CSV table of C-alpha atoms in Angstrom, one decimal:
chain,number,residue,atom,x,y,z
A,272,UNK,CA,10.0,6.0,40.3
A,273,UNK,CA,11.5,3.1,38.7
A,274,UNK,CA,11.6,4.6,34.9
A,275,UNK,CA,13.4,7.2,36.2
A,276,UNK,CA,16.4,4.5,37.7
A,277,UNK,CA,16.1,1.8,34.5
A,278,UNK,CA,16.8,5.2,32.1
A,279,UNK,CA,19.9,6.6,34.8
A,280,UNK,CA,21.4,3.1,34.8
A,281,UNK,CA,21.2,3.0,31.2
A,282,UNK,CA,22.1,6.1,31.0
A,283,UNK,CA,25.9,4.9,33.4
A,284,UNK,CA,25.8,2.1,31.0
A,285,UNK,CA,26.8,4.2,28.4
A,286,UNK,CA,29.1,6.5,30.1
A,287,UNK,CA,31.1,3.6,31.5
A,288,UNK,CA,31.2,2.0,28.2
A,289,UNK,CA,32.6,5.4,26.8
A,290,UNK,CA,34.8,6.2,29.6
A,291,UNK,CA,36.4,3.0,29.7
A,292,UNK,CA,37.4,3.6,25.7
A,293,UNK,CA,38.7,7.2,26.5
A,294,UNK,CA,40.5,5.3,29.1
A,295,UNK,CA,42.4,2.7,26.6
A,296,UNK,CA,43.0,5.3,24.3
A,297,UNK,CA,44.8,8.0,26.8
A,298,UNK,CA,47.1,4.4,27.6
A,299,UNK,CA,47.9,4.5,24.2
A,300,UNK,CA,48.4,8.1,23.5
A,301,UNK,CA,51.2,8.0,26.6
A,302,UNK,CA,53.0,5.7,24.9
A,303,UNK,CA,52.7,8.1,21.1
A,304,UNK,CA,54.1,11.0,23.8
A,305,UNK,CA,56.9,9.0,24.9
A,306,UNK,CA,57.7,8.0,21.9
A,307,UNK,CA,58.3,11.9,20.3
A,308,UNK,CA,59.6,12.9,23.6
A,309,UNK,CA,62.3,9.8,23.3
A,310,UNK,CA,62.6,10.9,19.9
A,311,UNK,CA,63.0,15.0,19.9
A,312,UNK,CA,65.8,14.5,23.0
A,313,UNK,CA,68.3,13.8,20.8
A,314,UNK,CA,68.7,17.2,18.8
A,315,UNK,CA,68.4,19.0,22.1
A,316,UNK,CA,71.7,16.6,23.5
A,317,UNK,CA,73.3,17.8,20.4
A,318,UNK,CA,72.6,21.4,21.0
A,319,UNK,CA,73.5,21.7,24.3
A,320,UNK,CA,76.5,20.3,24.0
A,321,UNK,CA,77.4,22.5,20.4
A,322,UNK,CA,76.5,25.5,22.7
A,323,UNK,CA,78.6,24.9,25.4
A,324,UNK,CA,81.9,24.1,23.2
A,325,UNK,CA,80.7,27.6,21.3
A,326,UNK,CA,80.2,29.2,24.9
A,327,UNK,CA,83.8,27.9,25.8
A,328,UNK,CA,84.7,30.8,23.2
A,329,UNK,CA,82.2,33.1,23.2
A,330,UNK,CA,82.1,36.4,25.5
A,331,UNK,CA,79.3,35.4,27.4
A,332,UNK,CA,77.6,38.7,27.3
A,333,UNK,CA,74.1,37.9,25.0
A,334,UNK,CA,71.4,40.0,26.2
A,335,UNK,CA,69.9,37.1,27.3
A,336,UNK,CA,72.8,36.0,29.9
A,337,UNK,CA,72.8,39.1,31.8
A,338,UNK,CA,69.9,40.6,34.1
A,339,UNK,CA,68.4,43.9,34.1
A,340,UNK,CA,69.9,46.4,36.5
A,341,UNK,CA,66.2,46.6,38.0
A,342,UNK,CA,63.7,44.1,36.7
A,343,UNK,CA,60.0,45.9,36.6
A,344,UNK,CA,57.6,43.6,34.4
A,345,UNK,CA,58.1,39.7,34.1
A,346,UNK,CA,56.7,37.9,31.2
A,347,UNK,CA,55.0,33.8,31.9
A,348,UNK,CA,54.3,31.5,30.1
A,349,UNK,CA,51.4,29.2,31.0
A,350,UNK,CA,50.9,25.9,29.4
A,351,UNK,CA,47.1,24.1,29.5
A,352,UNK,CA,45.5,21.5,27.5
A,353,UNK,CA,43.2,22.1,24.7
A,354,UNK,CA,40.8,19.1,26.2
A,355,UNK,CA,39.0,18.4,29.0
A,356,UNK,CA,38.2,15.1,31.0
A,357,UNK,CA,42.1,15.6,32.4
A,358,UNK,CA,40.9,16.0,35.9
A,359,UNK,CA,43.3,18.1,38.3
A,360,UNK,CA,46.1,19.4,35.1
A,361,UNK,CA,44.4,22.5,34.5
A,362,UNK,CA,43.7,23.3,38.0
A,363,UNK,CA,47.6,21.8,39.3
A,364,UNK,CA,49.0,24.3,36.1
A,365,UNK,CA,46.6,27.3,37.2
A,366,UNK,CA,47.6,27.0,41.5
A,367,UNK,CA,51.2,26.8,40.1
A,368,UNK,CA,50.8,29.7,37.9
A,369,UNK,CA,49.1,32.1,40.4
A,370,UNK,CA,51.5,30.8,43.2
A,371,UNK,CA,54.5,32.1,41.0
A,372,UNK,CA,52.3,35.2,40.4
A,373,UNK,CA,52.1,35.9,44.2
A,374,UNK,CA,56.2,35.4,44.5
A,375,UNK,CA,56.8,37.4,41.8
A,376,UNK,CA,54.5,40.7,43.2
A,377,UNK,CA,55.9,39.7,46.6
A,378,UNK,CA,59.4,40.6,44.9
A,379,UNK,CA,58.2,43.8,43.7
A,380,UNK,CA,57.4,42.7,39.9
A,381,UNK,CA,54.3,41.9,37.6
A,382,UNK,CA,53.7,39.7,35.4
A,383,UNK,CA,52.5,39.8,31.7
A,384,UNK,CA,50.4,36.9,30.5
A,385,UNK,CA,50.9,34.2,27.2
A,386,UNK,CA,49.1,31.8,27.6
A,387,UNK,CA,48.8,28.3,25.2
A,388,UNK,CA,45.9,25.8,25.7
A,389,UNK,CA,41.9,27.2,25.7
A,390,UNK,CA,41.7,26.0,29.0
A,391,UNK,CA,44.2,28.5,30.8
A,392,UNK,CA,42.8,31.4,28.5
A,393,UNK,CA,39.3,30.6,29.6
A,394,UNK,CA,40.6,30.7,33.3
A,395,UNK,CA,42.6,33.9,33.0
A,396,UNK,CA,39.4,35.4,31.1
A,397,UNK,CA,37.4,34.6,34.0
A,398,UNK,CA,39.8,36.0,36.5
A,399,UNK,CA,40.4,39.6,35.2
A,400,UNK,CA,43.8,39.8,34.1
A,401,UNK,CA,44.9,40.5,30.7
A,402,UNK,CA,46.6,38.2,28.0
A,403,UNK,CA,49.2,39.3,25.8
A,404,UNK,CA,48.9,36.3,23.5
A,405,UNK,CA,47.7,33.0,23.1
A,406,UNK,CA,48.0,30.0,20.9
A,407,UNK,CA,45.5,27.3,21.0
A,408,UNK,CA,45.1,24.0,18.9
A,409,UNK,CA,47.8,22.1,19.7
A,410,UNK,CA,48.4,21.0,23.1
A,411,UNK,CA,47.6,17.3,22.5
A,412,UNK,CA,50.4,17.4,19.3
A,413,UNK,CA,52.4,19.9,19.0
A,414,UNK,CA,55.1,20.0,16.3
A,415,UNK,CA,58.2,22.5,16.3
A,416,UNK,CA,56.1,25.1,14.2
A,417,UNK,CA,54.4,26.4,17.0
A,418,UNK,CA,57.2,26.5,19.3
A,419,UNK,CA,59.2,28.5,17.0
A,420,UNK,CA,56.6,31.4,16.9
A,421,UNK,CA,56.1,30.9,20.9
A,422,UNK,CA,59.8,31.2,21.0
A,423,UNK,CA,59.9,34.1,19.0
A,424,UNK,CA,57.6,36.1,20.7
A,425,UNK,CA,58.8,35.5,24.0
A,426,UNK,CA,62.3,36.4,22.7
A,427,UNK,CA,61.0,39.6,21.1
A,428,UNK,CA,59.3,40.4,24.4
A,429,UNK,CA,61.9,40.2,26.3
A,430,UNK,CA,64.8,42.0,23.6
A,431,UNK,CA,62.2,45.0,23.6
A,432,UNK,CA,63.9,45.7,27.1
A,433,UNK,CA,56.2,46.9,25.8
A,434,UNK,CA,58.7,44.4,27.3
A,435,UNK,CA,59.8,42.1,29.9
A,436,UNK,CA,63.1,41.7,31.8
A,437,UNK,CA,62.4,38.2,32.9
A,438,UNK,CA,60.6,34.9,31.3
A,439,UNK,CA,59.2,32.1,32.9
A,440,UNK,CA,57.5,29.0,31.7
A,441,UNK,CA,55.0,27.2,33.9
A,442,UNK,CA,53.9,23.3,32.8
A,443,UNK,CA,54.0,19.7,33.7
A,444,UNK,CA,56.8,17.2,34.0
A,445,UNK,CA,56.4,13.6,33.4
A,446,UNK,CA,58.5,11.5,36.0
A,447,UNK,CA,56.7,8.5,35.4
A,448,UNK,CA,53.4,7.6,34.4
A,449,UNK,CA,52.0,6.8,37.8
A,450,UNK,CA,53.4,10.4,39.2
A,451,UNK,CA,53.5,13.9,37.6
A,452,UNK,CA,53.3,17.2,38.8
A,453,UNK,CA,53.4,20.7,37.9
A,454,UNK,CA,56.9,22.7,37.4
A,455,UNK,CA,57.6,26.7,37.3
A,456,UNK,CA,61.2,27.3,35.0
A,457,UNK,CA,62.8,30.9,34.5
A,458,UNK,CA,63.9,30.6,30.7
A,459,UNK,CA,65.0,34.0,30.7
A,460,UNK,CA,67.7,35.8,31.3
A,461,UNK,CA,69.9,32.8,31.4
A,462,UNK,CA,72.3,31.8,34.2
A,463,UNK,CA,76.6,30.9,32.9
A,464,UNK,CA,77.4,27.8,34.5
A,465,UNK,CA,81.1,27.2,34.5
A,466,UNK,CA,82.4,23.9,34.8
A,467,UNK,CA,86.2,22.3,34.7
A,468,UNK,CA,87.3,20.5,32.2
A,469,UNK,CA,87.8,23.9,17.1
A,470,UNK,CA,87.0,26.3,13.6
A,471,UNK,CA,84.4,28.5,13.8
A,472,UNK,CA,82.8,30.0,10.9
A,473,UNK,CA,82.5,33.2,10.2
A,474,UNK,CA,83.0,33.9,14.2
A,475,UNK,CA,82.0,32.2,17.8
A,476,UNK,CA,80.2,35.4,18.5
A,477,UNK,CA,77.9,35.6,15.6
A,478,UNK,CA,77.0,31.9,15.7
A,479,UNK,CA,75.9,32.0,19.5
A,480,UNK,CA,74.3,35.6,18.8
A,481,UNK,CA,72.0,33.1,16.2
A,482,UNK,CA,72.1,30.3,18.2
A,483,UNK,CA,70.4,31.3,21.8
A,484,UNK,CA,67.0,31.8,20.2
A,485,UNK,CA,66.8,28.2,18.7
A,486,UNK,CA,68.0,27.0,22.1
A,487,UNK,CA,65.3,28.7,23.8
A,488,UNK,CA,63.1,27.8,20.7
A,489,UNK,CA,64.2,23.5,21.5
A,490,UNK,CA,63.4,23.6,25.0
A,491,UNK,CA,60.1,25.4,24.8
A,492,UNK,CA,59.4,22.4,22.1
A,493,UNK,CA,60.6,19.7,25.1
A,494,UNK,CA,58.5,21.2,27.7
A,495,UNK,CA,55.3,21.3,25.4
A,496,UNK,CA,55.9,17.4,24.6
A,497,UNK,CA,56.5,16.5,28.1
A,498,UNK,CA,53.3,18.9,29.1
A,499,UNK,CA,51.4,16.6,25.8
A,500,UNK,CA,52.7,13.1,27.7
A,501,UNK,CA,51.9,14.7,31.2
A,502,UNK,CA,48.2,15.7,29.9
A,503,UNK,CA,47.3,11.9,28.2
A,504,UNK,CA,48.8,10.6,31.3
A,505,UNK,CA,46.9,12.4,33.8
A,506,UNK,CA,43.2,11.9,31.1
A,507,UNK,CA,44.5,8.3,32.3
A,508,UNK,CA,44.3,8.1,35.3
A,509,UNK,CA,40.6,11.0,35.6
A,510,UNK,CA,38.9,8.8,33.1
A,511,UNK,CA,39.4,5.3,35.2
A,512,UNK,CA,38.0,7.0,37.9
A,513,UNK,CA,35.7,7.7,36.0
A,514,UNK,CA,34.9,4.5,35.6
A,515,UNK,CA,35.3,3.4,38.5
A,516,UNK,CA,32.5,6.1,40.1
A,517,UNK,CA,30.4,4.9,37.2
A,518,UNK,CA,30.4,1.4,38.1
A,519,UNK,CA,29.5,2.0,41.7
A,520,UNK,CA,27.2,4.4,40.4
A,521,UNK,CA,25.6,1.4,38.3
A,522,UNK,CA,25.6,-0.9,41.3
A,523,UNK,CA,23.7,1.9,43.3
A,524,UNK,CA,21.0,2.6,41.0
A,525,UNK,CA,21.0,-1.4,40.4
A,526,UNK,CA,19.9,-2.1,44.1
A,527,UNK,CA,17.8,0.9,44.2
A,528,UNK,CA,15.9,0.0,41.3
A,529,UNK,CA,15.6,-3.9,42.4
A,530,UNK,CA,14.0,-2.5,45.8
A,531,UNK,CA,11.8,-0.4,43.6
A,532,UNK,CA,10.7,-3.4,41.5
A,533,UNK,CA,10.3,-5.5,44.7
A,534,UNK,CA,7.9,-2.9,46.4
A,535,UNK,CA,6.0,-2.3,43.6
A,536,UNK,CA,5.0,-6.0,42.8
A,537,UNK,CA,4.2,-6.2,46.9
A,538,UNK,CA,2.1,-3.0,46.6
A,539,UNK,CA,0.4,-4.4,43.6
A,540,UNK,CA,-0.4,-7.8,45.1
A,541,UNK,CA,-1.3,-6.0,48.5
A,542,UNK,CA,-3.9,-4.4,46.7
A,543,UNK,CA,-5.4,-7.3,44.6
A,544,UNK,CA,-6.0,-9.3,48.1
A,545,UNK,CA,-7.4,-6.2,49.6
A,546,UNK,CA,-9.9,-6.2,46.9
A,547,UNK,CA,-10.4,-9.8,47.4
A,548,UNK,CA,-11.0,-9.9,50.7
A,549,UNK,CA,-13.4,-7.1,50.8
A,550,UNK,CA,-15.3,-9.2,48.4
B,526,UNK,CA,34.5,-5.2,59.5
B,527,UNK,CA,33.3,-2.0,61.9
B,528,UNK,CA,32.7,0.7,59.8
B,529,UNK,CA,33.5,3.2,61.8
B,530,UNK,CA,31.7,5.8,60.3
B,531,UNK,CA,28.4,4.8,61.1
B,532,UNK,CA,28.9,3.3,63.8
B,533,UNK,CA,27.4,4.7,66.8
B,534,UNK,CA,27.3,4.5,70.7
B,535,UNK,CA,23.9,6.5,71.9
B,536,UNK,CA,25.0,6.2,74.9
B,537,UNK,CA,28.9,6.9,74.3
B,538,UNK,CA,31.9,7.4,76.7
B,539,UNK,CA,30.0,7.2,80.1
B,540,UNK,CA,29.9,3.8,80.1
B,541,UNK,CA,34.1,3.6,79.1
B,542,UNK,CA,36.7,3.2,81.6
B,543,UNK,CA,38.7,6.6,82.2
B,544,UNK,CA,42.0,4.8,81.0
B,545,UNK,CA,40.2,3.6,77.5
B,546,UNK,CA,38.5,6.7,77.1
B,547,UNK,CA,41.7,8.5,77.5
B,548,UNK,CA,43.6,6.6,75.5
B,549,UNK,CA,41.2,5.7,72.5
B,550,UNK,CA,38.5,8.6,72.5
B,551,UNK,CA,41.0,10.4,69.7
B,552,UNK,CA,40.6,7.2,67.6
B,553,UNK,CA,37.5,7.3,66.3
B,554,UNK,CA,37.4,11.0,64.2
B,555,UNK,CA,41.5,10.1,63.5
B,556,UNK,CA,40.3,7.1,61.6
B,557,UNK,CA,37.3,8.7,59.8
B,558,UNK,CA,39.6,11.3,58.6
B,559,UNK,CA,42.3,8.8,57.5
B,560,UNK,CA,39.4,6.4,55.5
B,561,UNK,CA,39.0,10.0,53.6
B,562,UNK,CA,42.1,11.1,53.5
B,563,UNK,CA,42.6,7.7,51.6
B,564,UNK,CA,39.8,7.9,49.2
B,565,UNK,CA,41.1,11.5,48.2
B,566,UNK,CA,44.6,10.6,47.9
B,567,UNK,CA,43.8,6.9,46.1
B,568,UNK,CA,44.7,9.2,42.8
B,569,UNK,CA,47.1,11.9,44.2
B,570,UNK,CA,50.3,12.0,41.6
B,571,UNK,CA,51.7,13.9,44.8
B,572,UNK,CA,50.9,15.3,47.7
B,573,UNK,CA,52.2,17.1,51.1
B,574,UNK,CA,54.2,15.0,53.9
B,575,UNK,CA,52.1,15.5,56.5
B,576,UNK,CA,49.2,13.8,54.4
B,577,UNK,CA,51.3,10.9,53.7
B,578,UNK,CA,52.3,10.8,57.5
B,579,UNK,CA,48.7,10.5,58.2
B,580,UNK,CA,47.5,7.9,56.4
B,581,UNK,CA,50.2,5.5,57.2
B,582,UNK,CA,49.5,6.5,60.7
B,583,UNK,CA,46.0,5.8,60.1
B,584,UNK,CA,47.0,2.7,57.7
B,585,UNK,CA,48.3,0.8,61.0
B,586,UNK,CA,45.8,1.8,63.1
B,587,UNK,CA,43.6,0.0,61.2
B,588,UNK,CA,46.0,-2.7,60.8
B,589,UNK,CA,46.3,-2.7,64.5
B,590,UNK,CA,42.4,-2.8,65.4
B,591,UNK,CA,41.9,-6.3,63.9
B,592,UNK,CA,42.3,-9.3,65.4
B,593,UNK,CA,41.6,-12.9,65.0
B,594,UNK,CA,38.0,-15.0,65.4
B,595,UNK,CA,37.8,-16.4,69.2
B,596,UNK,CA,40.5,-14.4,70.7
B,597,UNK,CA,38.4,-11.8,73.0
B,598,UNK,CA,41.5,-9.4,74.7
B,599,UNK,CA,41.1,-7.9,78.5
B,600,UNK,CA,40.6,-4.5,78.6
B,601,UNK,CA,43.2,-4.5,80.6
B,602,UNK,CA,45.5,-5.5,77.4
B,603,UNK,CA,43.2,-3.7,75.0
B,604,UNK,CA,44.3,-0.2,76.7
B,605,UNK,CA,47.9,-1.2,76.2
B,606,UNK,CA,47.5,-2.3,72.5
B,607,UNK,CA,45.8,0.8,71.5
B,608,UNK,CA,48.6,2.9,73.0
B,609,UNK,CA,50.9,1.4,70.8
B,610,UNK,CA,49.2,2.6,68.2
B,611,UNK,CA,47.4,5.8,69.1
B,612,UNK,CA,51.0,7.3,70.9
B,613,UNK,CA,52.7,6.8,68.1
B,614,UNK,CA,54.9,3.9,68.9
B,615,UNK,CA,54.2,2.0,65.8
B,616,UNK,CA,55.6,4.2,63.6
């Protein structure tokens, strides 16, 4: 009946209004991601390049540099968002996730879990396979304190070799804010890639001994603020369509309603001149 | 502005000469499956090549099925300008 249509198109008014907003605001947040990703980049240049001119000396045999004679029990890292309204990241993330879980038990491994973002942990709760260890809180910012302990743990899980003789990271990269996609990294055990063509203090072996776990720690911290930029990006583009299925939904209920109104008045005068010609 | 969806013929291919209906009767489900294919991928960040091959397959058939106001074609030319596009020649 036609309360029922003047409350739902209401009802659309208000979501579209709201969507819209959420809309706006995701365009700016890009923009906030961007700017930290822009802005983090250049300490990870800076290590790269200090570790490779330390490698140059080094003796290249870190635990993490060399594989396992035969790799059992892989650890993965999953990366979600702590928000909904994203549309397809969670899912993109998940199919990504469980495709590299197939490939790995089609090699003859399993994986162990971590998980960050409550949307992957309520997924993986759902589906009956156990988390190590989650984090959760700080997917739309996070801020090198976090990455340090995910770094740490994942590093700890793999030097216990409970623990894990490979580790993988599964997230988003953002090419550009029209396209994006979901990306599957091996962090550990690192490949040596030689290329052709200094003091150090107390030794080069002692100072990439400290130094690989504040590598791993930086690029764990990258791929979290690209995931962050990916995430507003992708609430972007959901919450215009949105929108747009809100206004069409608003047009719909429009007509409906005016054909409503329309048949009702007819109805009502069909009646009066019944009345008045029984009379 | 056919919408090719709804559109209907109760009667359907008997009445449509054996060349048309062998060159054209694919069009129709092609077409519908594109206009979907498009609404779907309208917000795709990425997607497989065989989807993309599709909907620019099914992209100019649709640019190939207009035509201008006052400019009725023979069927005798309309068999010929829907091979073009349903063989694959526009690609």
């Amino acid at each position: 009946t036609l309360r029922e249509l003047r409350g739902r198109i209401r009802s659309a008014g208000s979501i579209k209004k709201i969507t819209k907003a959420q809309e706006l605001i995701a365009t700016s947040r890009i923009a906030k991601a961007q700017a930290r990703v822009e802005a983090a980049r250049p300490y990870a240049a800076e290590i790269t390049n200090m570790l490779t001119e330390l490698a140059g000396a080094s003796a290249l045999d870190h635990p993490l540099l060399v594989e396992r004679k035969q790799p059992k029990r892989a650890g993965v890292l999953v990366v979600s968002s702590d928000r909904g309204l994203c549309g397809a990241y969670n899912a993109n993330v998940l199919r990504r996730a469980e495709e590299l879980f197939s490939l790995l038990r089609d090699e003859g491994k399993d994986p162990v879990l971590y998980v960050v973002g409550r949307k992957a942990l309520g997924y993986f709760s759902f589906r009956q396979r156990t988390v190590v260890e989650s984090w959760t809180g700080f997917s739309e910012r996070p801020t090198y304190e976090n990455a340090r302990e995910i770094a740490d743990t994942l590093v700890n899980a793999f030097m216990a070799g409970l623990g894990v003789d490979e580790l993988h990271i599964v997230f988003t990269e953002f090419r550009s804010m029209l396209s994006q996609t979901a990306v599957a990294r091996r962090a550990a055990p690192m490949e040596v890639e030689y290329v052709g063509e200094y003091s150090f203090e107390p030794d080069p072996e002692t100072l990439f001994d400290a130094l690989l776990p504040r590598y791993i720690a930086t690029r764990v911290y990258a791929a979290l603020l690209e995931a962050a930029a990916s995430e507003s990006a992708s609430r972007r583009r959901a919450m215009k369509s949105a929108t747009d299925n809100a206004d069409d939904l608003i047009k719909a209920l429009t007509l409906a309603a005016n054909r409503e109104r329309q048949a009702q008045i007819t109805q009502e005068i069909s009646e009066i001149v019944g009345g008045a010609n029984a009379l | 502005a056919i919408n090719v969806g709804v559109s209907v013929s109760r009667v359907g291919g008997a009445a449509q000469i054996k060349a048309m209906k062998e060159v054209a009767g694919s069009l129709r489900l092609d077409l519908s499956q594109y206009r979907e294919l498009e609404a779907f991928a309208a917000f795709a960040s990425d997607l497989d090549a065989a989807s993309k091959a599709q909907l620019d397959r099914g992209a100019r058939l649709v640019e190939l099925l207009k035509q201008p106001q006052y400019s009725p074609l023979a069927v005798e030319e309309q068999v010929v300008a829907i091979f073009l596009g349903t063989q694959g020649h526009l690609d």
